[PDB]
Tab-separated table of C-alpha atoms in Angstrom:
chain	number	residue	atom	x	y	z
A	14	UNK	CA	-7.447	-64.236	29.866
A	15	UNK	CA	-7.830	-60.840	31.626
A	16	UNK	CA	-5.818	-58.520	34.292
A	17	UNK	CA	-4.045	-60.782	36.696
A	18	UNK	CA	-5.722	-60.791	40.490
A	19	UNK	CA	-5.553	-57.799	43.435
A	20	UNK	CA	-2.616	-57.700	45.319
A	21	UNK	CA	0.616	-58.831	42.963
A	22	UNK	CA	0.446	-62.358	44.128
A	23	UNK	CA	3.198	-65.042	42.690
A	24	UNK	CA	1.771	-67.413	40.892
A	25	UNK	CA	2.464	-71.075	42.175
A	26	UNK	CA	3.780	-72.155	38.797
A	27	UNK	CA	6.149	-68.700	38.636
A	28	UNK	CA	7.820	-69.863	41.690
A	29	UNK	CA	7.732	-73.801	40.470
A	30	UNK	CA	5.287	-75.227	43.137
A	31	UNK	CA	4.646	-79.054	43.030
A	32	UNK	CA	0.629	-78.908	41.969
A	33	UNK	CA	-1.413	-79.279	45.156
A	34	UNK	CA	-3.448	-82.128	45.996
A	35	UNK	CA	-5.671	-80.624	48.453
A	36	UNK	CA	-9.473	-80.626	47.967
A	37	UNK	CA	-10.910	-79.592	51.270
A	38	UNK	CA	-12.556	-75.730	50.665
A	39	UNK	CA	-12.691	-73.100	52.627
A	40	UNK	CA	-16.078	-71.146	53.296
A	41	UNK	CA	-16.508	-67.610	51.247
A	42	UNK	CA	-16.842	-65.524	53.405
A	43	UNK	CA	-13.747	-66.652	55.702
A	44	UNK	CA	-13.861	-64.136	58.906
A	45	UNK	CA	-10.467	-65.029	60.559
A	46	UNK	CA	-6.870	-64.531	59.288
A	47	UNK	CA	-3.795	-66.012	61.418
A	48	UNK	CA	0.059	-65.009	60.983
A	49	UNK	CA	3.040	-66.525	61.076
A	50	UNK	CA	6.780	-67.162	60.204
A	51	UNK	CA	8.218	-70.484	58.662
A	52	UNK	CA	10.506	-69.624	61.548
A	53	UNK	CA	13.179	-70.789	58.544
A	54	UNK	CA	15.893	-68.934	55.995
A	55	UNK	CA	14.464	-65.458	54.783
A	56	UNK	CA	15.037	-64.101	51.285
A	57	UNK	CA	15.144	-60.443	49.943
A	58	UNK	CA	14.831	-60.970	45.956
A	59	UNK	CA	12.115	-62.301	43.437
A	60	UNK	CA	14.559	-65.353	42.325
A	61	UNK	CA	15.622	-66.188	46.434
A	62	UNK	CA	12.393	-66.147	47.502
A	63	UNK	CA	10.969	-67.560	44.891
A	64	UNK	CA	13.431	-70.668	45.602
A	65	UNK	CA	12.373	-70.198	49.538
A	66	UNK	CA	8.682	-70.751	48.689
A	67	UNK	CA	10.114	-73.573	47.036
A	68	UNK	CA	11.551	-74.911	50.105
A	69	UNK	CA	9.218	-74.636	52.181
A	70	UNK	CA	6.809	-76.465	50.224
A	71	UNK	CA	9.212	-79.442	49.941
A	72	UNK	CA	9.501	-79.584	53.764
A	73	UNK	CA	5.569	-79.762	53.855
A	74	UNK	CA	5.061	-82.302	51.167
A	75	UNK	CA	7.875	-84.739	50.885
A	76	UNK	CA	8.526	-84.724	54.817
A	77	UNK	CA	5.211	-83.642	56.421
A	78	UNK	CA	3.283	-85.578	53.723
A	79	UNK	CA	0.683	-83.073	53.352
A	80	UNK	CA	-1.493	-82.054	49.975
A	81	UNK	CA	0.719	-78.606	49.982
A	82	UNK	CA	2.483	-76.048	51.420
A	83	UNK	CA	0.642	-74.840	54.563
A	84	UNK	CA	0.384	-71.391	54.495
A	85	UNK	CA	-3.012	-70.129	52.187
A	86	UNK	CA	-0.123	-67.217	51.353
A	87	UNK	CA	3.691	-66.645	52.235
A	88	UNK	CA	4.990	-63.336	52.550
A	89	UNK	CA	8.767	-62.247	51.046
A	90	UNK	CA	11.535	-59.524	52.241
A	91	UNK	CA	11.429	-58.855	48.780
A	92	UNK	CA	8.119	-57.424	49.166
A	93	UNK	CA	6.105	-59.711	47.235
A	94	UNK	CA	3.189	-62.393	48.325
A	95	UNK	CA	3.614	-65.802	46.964
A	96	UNK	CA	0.912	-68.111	46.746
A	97	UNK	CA	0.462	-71.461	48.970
A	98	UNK	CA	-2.822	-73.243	48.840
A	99	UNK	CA	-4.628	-69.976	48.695
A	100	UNK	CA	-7.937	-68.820	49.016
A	101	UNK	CA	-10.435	-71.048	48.447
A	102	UNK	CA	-8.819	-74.324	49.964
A	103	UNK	CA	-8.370	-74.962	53.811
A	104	UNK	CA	-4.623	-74.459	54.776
A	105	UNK	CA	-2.720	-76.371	57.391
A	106	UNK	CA	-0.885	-73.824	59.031
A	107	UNK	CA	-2.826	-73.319	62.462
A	108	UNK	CA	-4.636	-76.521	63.787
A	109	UNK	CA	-8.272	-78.335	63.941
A	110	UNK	CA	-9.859	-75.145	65.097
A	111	UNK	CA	-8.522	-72.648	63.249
A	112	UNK	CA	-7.411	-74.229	59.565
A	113	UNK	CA	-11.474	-74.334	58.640
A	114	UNK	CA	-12.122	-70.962	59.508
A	115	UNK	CA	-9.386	-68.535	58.298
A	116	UNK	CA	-6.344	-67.962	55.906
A	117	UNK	CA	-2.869	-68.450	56.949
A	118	UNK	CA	-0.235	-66.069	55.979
A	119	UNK	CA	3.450	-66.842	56.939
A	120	UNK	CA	6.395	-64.591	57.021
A	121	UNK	CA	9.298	-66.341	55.198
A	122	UNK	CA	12.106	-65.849	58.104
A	123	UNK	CA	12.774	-65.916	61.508
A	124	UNK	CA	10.754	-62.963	63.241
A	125	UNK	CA	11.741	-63.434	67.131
A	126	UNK	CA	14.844	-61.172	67.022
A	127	UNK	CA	14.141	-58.906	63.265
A	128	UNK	CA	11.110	-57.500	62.000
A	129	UNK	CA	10.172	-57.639	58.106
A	130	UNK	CA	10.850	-55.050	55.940
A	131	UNK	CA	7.998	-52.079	55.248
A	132	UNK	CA	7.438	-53.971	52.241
A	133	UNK	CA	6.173	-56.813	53.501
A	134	UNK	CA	4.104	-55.832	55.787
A	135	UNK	CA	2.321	-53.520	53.016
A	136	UNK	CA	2.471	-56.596	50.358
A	137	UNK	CA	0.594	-58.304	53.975
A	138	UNK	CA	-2.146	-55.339	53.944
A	139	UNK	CA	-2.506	-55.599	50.416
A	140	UNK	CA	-3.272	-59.415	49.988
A	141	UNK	CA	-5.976	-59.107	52.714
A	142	UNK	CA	-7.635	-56.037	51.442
A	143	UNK	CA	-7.257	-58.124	47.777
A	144	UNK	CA	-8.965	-61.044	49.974
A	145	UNK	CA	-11.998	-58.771	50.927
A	146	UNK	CA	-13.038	-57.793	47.205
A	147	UNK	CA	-12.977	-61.026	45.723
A	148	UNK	CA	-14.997	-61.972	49.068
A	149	UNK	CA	-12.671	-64.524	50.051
A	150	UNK	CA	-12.335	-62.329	52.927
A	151	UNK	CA	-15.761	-60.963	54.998
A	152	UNK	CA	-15.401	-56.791	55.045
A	153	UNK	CA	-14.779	-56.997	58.710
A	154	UNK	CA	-11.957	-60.027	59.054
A	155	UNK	CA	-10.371	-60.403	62.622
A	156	UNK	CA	-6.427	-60.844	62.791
A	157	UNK	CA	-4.899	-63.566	65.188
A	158	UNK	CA	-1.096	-64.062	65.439
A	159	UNK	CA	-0.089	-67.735	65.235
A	160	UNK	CA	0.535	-67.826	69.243
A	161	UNK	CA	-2.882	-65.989	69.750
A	162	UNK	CA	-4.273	-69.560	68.970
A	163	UNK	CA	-1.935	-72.705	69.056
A	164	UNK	CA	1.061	-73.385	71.888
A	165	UNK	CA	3.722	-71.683	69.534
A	166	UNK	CA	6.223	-68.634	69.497
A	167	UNK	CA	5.332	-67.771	65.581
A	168	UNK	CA	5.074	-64.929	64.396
A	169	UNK	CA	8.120	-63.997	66.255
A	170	UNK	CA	8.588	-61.711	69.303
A	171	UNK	CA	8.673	-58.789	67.061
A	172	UNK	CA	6.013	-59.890	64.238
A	173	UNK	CA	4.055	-60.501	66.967
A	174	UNK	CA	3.739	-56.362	68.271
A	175	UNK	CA	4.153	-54.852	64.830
A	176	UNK	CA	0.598	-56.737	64.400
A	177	UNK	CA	-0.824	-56.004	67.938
A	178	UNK	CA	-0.537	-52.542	65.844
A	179	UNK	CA	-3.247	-53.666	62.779
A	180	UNK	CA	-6.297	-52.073	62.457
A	181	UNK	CA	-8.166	-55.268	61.917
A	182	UNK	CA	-6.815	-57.348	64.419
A	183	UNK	CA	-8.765	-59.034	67.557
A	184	UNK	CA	-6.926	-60.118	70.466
B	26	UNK	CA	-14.693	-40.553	50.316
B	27	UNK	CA	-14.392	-44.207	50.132
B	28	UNK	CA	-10.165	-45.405	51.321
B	29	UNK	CA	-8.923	-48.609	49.952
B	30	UNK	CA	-5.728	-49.938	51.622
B	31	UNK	CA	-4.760	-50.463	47.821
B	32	UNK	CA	-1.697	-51.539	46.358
B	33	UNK	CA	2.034	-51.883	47.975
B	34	UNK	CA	3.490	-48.879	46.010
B	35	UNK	CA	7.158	-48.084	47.621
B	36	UNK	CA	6.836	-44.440	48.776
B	37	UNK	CA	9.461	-41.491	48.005
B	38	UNK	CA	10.796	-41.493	51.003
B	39	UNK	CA	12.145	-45.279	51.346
B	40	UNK	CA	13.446	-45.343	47.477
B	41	UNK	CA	15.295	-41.996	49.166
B	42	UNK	CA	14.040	-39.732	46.420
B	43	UNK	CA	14.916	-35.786	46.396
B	44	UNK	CA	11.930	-33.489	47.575
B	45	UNK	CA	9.479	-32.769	44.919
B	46	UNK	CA	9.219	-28.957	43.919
B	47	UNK	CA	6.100	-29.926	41.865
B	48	UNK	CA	2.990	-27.840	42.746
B	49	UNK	CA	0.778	-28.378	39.523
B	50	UNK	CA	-2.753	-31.458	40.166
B	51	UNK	CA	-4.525	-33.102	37.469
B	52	UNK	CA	-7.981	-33.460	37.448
B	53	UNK	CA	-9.842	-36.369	39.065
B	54	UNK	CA	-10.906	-38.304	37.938
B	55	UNK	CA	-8.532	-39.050	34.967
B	56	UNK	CA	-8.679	-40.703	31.657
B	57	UNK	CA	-5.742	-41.753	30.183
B	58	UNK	CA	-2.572	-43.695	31.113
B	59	UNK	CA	0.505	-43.807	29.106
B	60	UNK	CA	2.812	-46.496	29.323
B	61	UNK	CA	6.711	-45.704	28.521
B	62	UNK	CA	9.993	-47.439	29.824
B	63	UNK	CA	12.895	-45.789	30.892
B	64	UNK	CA	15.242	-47.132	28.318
B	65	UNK	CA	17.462	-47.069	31.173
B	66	UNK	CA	18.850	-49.587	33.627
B	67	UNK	CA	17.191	-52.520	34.664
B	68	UNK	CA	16.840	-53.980	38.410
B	69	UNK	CA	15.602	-57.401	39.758
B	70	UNK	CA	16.130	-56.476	43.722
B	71	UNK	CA	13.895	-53.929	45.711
B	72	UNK	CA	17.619	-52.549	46.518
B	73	UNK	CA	18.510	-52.316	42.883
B	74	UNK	CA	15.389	-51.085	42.084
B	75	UNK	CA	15.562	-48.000	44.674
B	76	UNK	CA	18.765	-47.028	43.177
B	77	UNK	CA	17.559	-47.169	39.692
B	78	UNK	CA	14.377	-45.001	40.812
B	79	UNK	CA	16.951	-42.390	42.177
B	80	UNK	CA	18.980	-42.475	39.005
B	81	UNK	CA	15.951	-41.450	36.718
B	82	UNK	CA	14.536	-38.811	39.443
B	83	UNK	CA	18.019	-37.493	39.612
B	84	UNK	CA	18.193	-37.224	35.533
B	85	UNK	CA	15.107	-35.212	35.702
B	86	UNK	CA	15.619	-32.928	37.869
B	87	UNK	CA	19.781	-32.349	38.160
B	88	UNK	CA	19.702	-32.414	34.739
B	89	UNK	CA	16.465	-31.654	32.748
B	90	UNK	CA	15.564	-29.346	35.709
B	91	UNK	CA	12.035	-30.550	35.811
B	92	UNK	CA	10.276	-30.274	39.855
B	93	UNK	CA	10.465	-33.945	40.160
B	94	UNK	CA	10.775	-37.307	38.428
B	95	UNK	CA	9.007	-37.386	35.453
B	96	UNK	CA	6.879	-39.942	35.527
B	97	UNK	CA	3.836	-40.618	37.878
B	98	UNK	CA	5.008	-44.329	38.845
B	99	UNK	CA	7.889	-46.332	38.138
B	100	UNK	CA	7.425	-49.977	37.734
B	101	UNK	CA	10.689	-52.482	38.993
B	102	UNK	CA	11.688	-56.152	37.293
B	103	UNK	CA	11.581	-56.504	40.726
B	104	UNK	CA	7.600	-57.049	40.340
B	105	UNK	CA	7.692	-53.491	42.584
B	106	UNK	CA	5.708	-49.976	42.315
B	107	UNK	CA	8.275	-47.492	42.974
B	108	UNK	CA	5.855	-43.620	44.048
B	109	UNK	CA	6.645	-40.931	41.473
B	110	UNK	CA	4.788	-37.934	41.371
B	111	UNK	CA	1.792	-39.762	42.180
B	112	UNK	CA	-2.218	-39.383	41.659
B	113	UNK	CA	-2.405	-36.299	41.593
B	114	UNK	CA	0.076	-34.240	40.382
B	115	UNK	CA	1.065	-33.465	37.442
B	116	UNK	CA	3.892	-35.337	35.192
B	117	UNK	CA	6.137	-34.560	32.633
B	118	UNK	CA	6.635	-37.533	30.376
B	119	UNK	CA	4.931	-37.397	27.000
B	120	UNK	CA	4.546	-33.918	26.031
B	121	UNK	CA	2.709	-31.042	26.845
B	122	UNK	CA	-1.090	-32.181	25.291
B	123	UNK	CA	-1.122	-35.749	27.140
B	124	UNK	CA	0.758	-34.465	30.335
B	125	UNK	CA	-2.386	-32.278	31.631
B	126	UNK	CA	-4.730	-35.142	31.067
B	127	UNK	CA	-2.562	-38.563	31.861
B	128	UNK	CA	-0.691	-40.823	34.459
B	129	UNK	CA	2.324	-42.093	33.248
B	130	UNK	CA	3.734	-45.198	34.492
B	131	UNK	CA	7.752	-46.273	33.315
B	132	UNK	CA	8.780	-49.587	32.995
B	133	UNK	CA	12.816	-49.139	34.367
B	134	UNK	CA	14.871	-50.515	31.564
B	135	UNK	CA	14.878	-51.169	27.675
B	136	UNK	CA	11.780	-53.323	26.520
B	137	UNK	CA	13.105	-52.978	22.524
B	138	UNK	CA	14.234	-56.797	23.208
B	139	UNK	CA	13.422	-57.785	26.150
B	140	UNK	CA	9.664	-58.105	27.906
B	141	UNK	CA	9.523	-57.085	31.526
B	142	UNK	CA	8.747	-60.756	33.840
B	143	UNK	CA	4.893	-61.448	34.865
B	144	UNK	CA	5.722	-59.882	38.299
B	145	UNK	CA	6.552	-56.408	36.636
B	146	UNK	CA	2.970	-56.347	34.644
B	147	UNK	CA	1.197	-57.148	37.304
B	148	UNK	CA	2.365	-54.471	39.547
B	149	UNK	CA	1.922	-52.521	36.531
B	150	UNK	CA	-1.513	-53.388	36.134
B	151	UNK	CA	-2.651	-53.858	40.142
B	152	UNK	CA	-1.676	-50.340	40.379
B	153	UNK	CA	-3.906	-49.734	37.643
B	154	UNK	CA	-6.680	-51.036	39.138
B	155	UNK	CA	-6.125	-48.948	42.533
B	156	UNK	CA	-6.115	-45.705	40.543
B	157	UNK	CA	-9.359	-46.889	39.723
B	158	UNK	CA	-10.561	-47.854	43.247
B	159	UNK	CA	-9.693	-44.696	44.609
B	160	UNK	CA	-10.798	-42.588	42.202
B	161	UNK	CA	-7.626	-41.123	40.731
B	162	UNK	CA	-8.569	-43.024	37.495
B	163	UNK	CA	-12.206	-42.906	35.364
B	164	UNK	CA	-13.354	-46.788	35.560
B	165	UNK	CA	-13.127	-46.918	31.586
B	166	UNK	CA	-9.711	-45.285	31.593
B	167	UNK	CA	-7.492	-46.100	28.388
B	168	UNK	CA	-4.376	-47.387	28.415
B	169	UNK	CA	-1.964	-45.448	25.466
B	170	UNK	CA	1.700	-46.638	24.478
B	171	UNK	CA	4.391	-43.407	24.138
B	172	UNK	CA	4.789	-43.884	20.766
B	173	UNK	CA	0.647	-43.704	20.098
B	174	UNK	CA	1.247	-40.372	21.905
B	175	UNK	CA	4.640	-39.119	20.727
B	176	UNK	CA	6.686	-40.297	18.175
B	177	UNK	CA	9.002	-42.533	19.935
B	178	UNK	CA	10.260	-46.952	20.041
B	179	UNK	CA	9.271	-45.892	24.080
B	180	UNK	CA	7.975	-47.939	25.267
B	181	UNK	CA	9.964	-50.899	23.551
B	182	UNK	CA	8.991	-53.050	20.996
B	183	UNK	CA	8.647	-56.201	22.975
B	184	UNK	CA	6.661	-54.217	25.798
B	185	UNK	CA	4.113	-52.451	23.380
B	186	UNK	CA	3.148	-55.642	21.812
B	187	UNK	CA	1.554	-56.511	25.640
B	188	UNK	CA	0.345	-53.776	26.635
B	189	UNK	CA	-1.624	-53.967	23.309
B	190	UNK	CA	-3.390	-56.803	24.494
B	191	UNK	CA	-4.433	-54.945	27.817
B	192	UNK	CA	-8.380	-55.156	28.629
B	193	UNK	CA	-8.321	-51.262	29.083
B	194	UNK	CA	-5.870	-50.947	25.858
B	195	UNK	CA	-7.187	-47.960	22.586
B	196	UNK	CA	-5.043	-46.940	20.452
């Protein structure tokens, strides 16, 4: 009943996410952060995107069979953030090691052979430095791309640089 | 001082805005914020949006020959913060007693009947909160409508009824 939170995120409702059914919670303060792509169809407006997040989701839940979507946070073209299962509860997005320890955030597109816009990569800073004030995220969080920690080509072959490029990021 | 990565605010440059000509800075930290909408064109696309940003700049300056747009921020249906004259200088949207001492953020479009979406008052309102964390804004700044400020429907029926019931909201 207040000023929504930091860092513009969707709402899951706005973007008409199936409630989650996860329970398992992640540790305040989480130190690492992994990214990816969905390595599926990109989108470049609220209402696609919106629809994408949508998507994805579906794959995750009626196909996978998980709680949610796997990604703690997914990332538009249209420069917004739309939220997955998160802060507080443990994703799914980066194995056994890594799910209990850090917050996934996943590009929405195919990042191997395109990069994503200026936008998203700012609405990307944004949502972490929004993760560090609420104290989701410890003041000193470590970066990992998706293949910097499971057998996998996520981000993308460009993603993947762009972030070698982050201030916060530990190879 | 202290730098917070706040905010995704799309800068001049990538909205392809004119050169500014202003030269005039408000005072840090500042007080007041007044909301008004463009009673323009509205956009739902960050490619829409950049066009409509150029429109209004373009207004202002080819043909109210002010230095720059108007307004301090712009604020897109596209849930988007679109970089006007900034923190800290000077803007020219609601006279010359509140211009010296204000930021003034525009809604792009016609709120008389219409309310912006949850993505646009959050922007609206995350930016808010990053004048704040950097300093641009007092912590108790006070959020005016146009019409509290100049006689005016800016900024829109519909729209002045929420910002009314903004936490940072006077009369």
């Amino acid at each position: 009943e207040d000023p929504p939170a930091c860092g513009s995120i969707v709402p899951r409702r706005e973007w008409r996410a199936l409630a989650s059914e996860c329970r398992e919670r992640l540790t305040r303060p989480v130190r690492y952060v992994v990214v990816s792509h969905t390595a599926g169809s990109h989108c470049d407006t609220p209402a696609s995107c919106a629809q994408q997040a949508q998507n994805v989701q579906s794959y995750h839940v009626r196909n996978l069979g998980w709680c949610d979507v796997g990604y703690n946070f997914l990332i538009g073209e249209d420069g917004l953030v739309y939220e997955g299962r998160g802060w507080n509860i443990k994703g799914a997005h980066a194995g056994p090691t890594w799910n209990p320890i850090s917050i996934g955030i996943s590009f929405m597109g195919n990042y191997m052979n395109r990069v994503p816009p200026p936008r998203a990569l700012r609405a990307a800073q944004n949502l972490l430095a929004c993760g560090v004030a609420l104290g989701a995220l410890r003041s000193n969080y470590e970066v990992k791309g998706h293949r910097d920690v499971q057998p996998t080509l996520s981000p993308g072959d460009r993603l993947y640089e762009i972030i070698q490029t982050w201030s916060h990021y530990r190879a």
